[PDB]
Swiss-Prot record:
Originating organism: Saccharomyces cerevisiae (strain ATCC 204508 / S288c) (Baker's yeast)
GO biological process, one term: transcription by RNA polymerase II
Subunit composition and interactions: TFIIE is a tetramer of two alpha (TFA1) and two beta (TFA2) subunits.
Residues of the full protein shown: 4 to 118 of 482
Coiled-coil region list: none
Keywords: Metal-binding, Nucleus, Transcription, Transcription regulation, Zinc, Zinc-finger
Domain HTH TFE/IIEalpha-type residues, every copy: 6-96
GO molecular function: RNA polymerase II complex binding; zinc ion binding
Protein name: Transcription initiation factor IIE subunit alpha
Cellular component GO terms, alphabetical: mitochondrion; nucleus; transcription factor TFIIE complex; transcription preinitiation complex
Keyword Metal-binding: yes
Length: 115
DNA sequence: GCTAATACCGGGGCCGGGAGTGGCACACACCTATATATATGTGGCTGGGCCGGGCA
């Protein structure tokens, strides 16, 4: 289908331009449509200061959007859970525009050393 | 002159937190044991002679 080609695209871009934990979180969202913050912490066994910059990096690239869902279950605790969701069109647009900017920025450097 | 729908304020009940307390993990210095030369520098303890108090 067309939806799976977007998944392979995100795997190629995140795997190709970032480290491993980025595709760890990425695949962790590709397996579960709504991934809680406590599930990703207990999954990769990473600290909060290590889960922070990863989610912030995946949000700065417009790859995923977050959904802070409310909770008032058992102990009447307002348990908020940041459920991550893959933003397909904004991520594809980010990939296309970033590729265009890479081509344009690598084309300008050739004209300077030509003379 | 008369009546029903609308909006503002207060009280009792309910939820999040962060400095406090406590717990867990990792890394680095101490200092006990022993050795010689050296000496001022006391700190502390003990025996003999002298004096004052108790006793015959």
């Amino acid at each position: 289908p067309i939806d799976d080609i977007v998944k392979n695209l995100l795997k190629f871009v995140v795997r190709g331009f970032y480290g491993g934990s980025f595709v760890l979180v990425l695949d962790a969202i590709l397996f579960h449509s709504v991934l809680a913050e406590d599930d990703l912490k207990q999954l990769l066994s990473i600290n909060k200061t290590e889960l922070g910059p990863l989610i912030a990096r995946l949000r700065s690239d417009r790859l995923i959007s977050i959904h802070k869902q409310r909770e008032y279950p058992p102990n009447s605790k307002s348990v908020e859970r940041v459920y991550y969701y893959v933003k397909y069109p904004h991520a594809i647009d980010a990939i296309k525009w970033k590729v265009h900017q890479v081509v344009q920025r690598l084309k300008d450097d050739l004209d300077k050393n030509s003379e």
